[PDB]
């Protein structure tokens, strides 16, 4: 079920369960425009940042 959600503090939570990747389950910045690559890489762009 690839329906990921972001909490207030920036945790990728699927139905209340944090997603697990290599080297720690998951963590994202506060409000970045999340972009997920074709292989799994999660690109992050701080809003307002160039």
């Amino acid at each position: 079920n690839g329906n990921i959600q972001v909490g207030p503090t920036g945790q990728l939570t699927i139905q209340g369960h944090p997603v697990i990747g290599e080297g720690g389950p998951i963590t994202v910045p506060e409000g970045s425009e999340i972009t997920i690559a074709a292989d799994g890489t999660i690109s992050a762009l701080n809003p307002g940042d160039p």
Partner: protein, 253 residues
């Protein structure tokens, strides 16, 4: 009798799906509106019996489905020109802040503002915009730039006089805002504490004067989803009918 409850849950899930679809369709021409989609999930599974090459011979009965959440797509809608001098549209993220009569504060997205009798700028409905922008009388024109600065010119003035700034707030997780009626949202624990900033800085949006943000509702998606909802409802009713036939035959004999 379990099948009856399972089919009842399925029918209720389809009913709520149709409800959100109808709500999306109804306010298709509401300024600054965001579509919603409902997500369902499975219930608990009863493990009746634990499990050369044959089938595992294990039993695991499901229970049904319930609606879990309704997510709003905080995307960017198209901009339509109203030619008014006091309509603003947001390019990017951010919410205007208004003061509720009881005392707390709410946050909105659409821009359609009027001027009260005392002169302050309020929304359509009488609620006051929080930074308290006051527009004096004998105002020849009003200008709201891409920044938060709002200026008014007067008779025989070489340069305009600034009469305030429209700072706007942002949230860490804008999906978690609880949406009370009347095109308003309130801060909840799911969303972060709001942080205010001038437009164009700290990740906020930009202000376009004379335009309004239309709803981002895709009608074709709604129609296809509606067809699927009707067909699934008709399929699920067949389960109830067949279970009724089984029970009637059992009671008869």
């Amino acid at each position: 009798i379990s099948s009856l409850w399972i089919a009842k849950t399925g029918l209720d899930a389809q009913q709520t799906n149709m409800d959100v679809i109808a709500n999306n369709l109804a306010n298709v021409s509401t300024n600054g509106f965001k579509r919603q989609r409902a997500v369902f999930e499975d219930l608990l599974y009863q493990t009746i019996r634990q499990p050369q090459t044959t089938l595992p011979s294990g039993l695991q009965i499901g229970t049904g489905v319930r609606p879990v959440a309704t997510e709003r797509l905080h995307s960017q809608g198209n901009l339509s020109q109203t030619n008014n001098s006091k309509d603003v549209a947001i390019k990017g993220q951010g919410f205007f802040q208004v003061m509720l009569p009881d005392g707390t504060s709410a946050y909105t997205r659409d821009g359609s503002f009027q001027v009260d009798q005392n002169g302050q700028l309020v929304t359509a409905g009488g609620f006051q915009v929080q930074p308290a922008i006051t527009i004096p009388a004998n105002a020849l024109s009003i200008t709201i730039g891409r920044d938060g600065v709002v200026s008014v010119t007067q008779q025989g003035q070489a340069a305009p006089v600034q009469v305030g700034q429209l700072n706007l707030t942002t949230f860490m997780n804008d999906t978690g805002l609880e949406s009370i009626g009347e095109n308003l949202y309130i801060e909840t624990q799911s969303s972060g504490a709001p942080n205010e900033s001038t437009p164009g800085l700290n990740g906020a949006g930009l202000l376009y004067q004379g335009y309004v943000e239309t709803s981002n509702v895709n009608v074709a998606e709604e129609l296809v989803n509606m067809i699927q909802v009707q067909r699934a409802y008709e399929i699920n009713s067949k389960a109830v009918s067949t279970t009724d036939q089984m029970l009637q035959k059992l009671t008869q004999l």
